[PDB]
Amino acid sequence: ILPDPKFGSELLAKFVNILMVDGKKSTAESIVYSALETLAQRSGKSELEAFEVALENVRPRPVRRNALAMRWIVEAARKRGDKSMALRLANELSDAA
Amino acid sequence: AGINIPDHKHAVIALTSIYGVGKTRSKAILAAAGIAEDVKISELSEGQIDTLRDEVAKFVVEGDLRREISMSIKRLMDLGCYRGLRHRRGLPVRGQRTKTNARTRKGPRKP
Amino acid sequence: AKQSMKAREVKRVALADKYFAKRAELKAIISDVNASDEDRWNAVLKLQTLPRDSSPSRQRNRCRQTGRPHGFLRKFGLSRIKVREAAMRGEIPGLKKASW
Amino acid sequence: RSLKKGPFIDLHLLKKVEKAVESGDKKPLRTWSRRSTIFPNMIGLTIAVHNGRQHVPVFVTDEMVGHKLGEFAPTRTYR
Amino acid sequence: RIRIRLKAFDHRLIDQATAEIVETAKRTGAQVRGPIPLPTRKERFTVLISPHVNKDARDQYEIRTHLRLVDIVEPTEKTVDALMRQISL
Amino acid sequence: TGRRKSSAARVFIKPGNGKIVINQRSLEQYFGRETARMVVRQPLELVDMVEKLDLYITVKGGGISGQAGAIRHGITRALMEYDESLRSELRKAGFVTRDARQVERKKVGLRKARRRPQFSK
Amino acid sequence: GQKVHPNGIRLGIVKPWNSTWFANTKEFADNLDSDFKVRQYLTKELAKASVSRIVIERPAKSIRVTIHTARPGIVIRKVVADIAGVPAQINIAEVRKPELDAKLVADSITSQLERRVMFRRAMKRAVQNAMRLGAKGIKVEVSGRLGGAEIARTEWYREGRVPLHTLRADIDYNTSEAHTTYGVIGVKVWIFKGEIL
RNA sequence: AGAACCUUACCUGGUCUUGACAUCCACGGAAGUUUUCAGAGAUGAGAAUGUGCCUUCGGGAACCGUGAGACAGGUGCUGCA
RNA sequence: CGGCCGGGAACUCAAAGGAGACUGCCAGUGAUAAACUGGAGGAAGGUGGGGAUGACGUCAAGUCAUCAUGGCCCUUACGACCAGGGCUACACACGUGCUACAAUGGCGCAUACAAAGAGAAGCGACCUCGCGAGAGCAAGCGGACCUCAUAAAGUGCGUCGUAGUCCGGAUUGGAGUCUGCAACUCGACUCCAUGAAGUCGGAAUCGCUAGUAAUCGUGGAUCAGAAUGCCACGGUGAAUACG
């Protein structure tokens, strides 16, 4: 299990792996980079790096809880398009805050 | 004219809306008439549209293409060749398989 | 795979090796297209007088000892069952269990 | 026929057309080589085609001057 | 200059043949260099076993024909004698 | 020298103080996608003497991550021939090189290597 | 139910091929047709000559046919020299152990079943004469119409040790087809000599 | 691991039947080649040419045709021989 | 400033001969036994991975249609030949894939990366013609050099923007190109136009635990030409295995 130490965040590495459908890695890296760009609007309190309010979601081991939460977040993200690389992060922010 | 009035589209994309001119034909017409490809019809002035009208009337128009297709298929069916017989009965003419496929040619799968 | 079928094959290849050179020159003079449309018409005239046989389009190259029209290769000249039996009994160089 | 060479019409069909012009009165023009196309000497002719089991006669004129011989007489049938 | 190619089937067979060739060439002289073993051509093709319905039954057959070659800088009379005791001039 | 999923890689030690040229081209020009540079920098940042010594590397075969792993094995073999204490220090951490995870041979009667075709009743 | 050929899987392992010649594709095909025709001709002309093994070698435009068999004083290359456009020579190798050759014991089994000797007695005599010589493993098998009745059976006898999942095994396997008034009888013979490779 | 014609084992009409394919007998002719006509082709009738290697020279040897007896051919049936 | 040549056998590669991991060692568990867990060394640690390797017998399973064969039958024939047609027919249903139902998407421009295999009654450099399938010319190569041979997803810029829309491609028309005596039933491809259904799939059912599935591309057998089939290889590369 190789992480991505460019941002660290093995959770973000798992997010890249779960958005890496059909194995496409560089496109998923561009996806998460646009995600970081859209998150840098507010950036919270190191919210661009880690997620605090996204853990205690409405659809709940802590690793398995985090995995089910990221599955629900990715599902609710890819459920819609309409400039998906912004609207998916908008749905993520709506489910988080 | 009255046909092909879209909104917020490029010139070559808009020119596909005419029955008889599509992508490559629109590219050829714009290259022959010196019209910009990436510009929109709202920002396009009428001075180039007045040339594009005869430039597209040089080739086949919607009604002329429709009546030519109708005349060709009615000629084939009155001549009564294998192509005309299959066109009258609703079967393909290019040697396709009518066993399980050719459902688009045969019609709805009701029975 | 019959005696009649292998007789057809040997008479077909014999007719091909007989009328090969004239058909080859005819295909050549059909291929060169610079002038002489009447000579092209006389070429297709000679081609139509030539029978439909004696051509690689007619050559089917089936098996030799069995005459099987299916399961043929242009390297061993036999059927699948016969080349498997040959590699089975071991009278041909190579053909071990390919495992990579 | 790659649409650039001369059209393919068989010699025996050609000589039967010649005999039809001479004395054959254009009626019993049986054709087995339906693979041949039509070139403009065959206008207003009654050509029988061996498309299936026997010969069926069709009337070919100048409107069908360029076509395939097997188009006119098919070999498919429905109940 | 003079390229002498040789082919065999077994690895020990082509090794013994190339050893005989290089020993004759060392007996002759002319500063013969060592063997140049080239990668072999793998001729594989799948064959259905029975003449009836079976798609899993397919044997795999391997062809490993060794093709090696040696080089000679200059052809001399002793090299011709060692030849007449594939060629490329 | 090292390899990774059919990607030959040759390394040559040369102190250049920031001189990384691959196939007579810079790394930013030849490679990219903002991931290969980082996964090559991952051994280069922890214990590799990232400055005052560089590597001239050439590749032949492989894709992107295959060539990345190939040049990673090349630079770790360069470190091994450089010294052995740094080899022990790298092996104490999670840097066990020579991971053999190549592609599996296509099977017979299947649509892919480990995918049986679909069958009904 | 469906095993592999011991010699066919151990071509490069213990028992080498019966043909040594390299050629290109057309040359390989013509050479295969030629060697198959001369082998069929030699078998149908000397089937009573106790022929066991036929090995062909072609170094460079020259045929060498070696016949490994027993009782060599039966024949003495004219036929192969007349049917081939390449000069050919023949060699005869009188090998020992005449009761262990698979072709010879198969010919004996077929001759006995055509002479209407009992099948159990024939297989027992074969395995006894092959084990008394000093072998290690002998497996015989007779398939198809055991007794000429309408019900076919595969009767096989085993003795000693006849391994088939050991690749270094010196096992020879042969098939024989006898054409009798009840049809055809197929005999598969296995002979295990030793364990060395 | 491959249907345009062959494939093709099938159907429409024309053919040949010791046969398309392997072998025996007696006779004639080396073999072979160019080419015309009837014809969808299979098929029949012509017009010229070549005439060898050996010669027991009433003939050897491959080859083409004529007549008959054996046979042959069958992807026709029975894997429940 | 092309490994192009001198130069070198350092390195890759090539094919050979060997070696390297065999419970080899320590601790603990386990009836000291067998055996198991953890750890060091080690590229590989518990048959490393994969292929091959198919027991006695079961289905009187398929094949006398590739073939061999007991019997039965045709033998002016079910035997040989010829042309056309069928094998590709179409009220309908089932199976295996492919293309999609787009925005990790389509298209326009520049551009990075291979393995493996094949080739001479062939591959085809290179030029010209053509918007094109391809045509004339033609060195080299039965071959690690010559040819197939420009891999694409990716990267960088731009275009739209959630619609049958610039997604997708069925059908049809006009005109060509290639192999082939011959492209109409009965080939493939291309120029243009038309661009349909399709907007994520019911009861139910299939494959998959690893650089596998998933996604994209390439080569070959077969073959005059004609495969979304089959056989091999490569690019990126998951999540889960509490039981």
Side-chain angles (χ1 to χ4, degrees), chain G residues 21-93 95 97-115 117:
Chain G
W21 49 275
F22 183 80
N24 273 230
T25 56
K26 312 176 176 183
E27 310 170 349
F28 209 104
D30 301 353
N31 198 284
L32 276 183
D33 286 293
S34 68
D35 60 55
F36 259 85
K37 282 195 300 300
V38 302
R39 282 170 184 263
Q40 289 162 359
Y41 205 99
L42 211 158
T43 48
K44 73 181 178 58
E45 78 182 346
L46 294 176
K48 302 183 299 180
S50 74
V51 176
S52 183
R53 300 299 169 88
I54 304 296
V55 185
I56 318 183
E57 161 64 83
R58 302 165 175 99
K61 306 172 180 297
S62 54
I63 327 288
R64 302 152 61 93
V65 178
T66 61
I67 307 180
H68 299 71
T69 171
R71 302 183 301 181
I74 303 180
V75 184
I76 298 179
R77 76 274 179 180
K78 289 91 59 182
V79 179
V80 57
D82 292 6
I83 203 182
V86 175
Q89 69 168 357
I90 53 170
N91 307 121
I92 300 101
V95 81
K97 304 297 184 177
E99 308 160 354
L100 282 186
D101 284 84
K103 276 282 175 57
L104 303 186
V105 69
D107 207 340
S108 69
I109 284 298
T110 53
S111 175
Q112 288 166 356
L113 65 92
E114 287 163 0
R115 282 171 36 90
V117 192

Side-chain angles (χ1 to χ4, degrees), chain C residues 1-9 11-12 18-19 22 46 51-52 57-60 62 69-72 80:
Chain C
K2 313 176 185 58
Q3 279 74 14
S4 59
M5 299 309 173
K6 64 188 186 183
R8 282 189 52 86
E9 284 289 331
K11 75 195 299 180
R12 176 191 291 102
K18 180 176 183 175
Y19 294 157
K22 184 151 57 184
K46 291 305 177 62
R52 303 190 179 189
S57 60
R58 294 300 294 263
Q59 295 292 324
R60 197 77 281 171
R62 62 177 57 182
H70 296 166
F72 180 83
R80 293 176 289 100

Side-chain angles (χ1 to χ4, degrees), chain B residues 10 18 22 24-25 83 93-94 96 98-99 103 106:
Chain B
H10 296 259
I18 310 183
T24 312
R25 187 59 189 173
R83 303 166 52 184
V93 299
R94 290 189 172 91
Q96 310 168 14
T98 70
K99 179 165 183 54
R103 188 60 57 169
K106 192 165 56 179

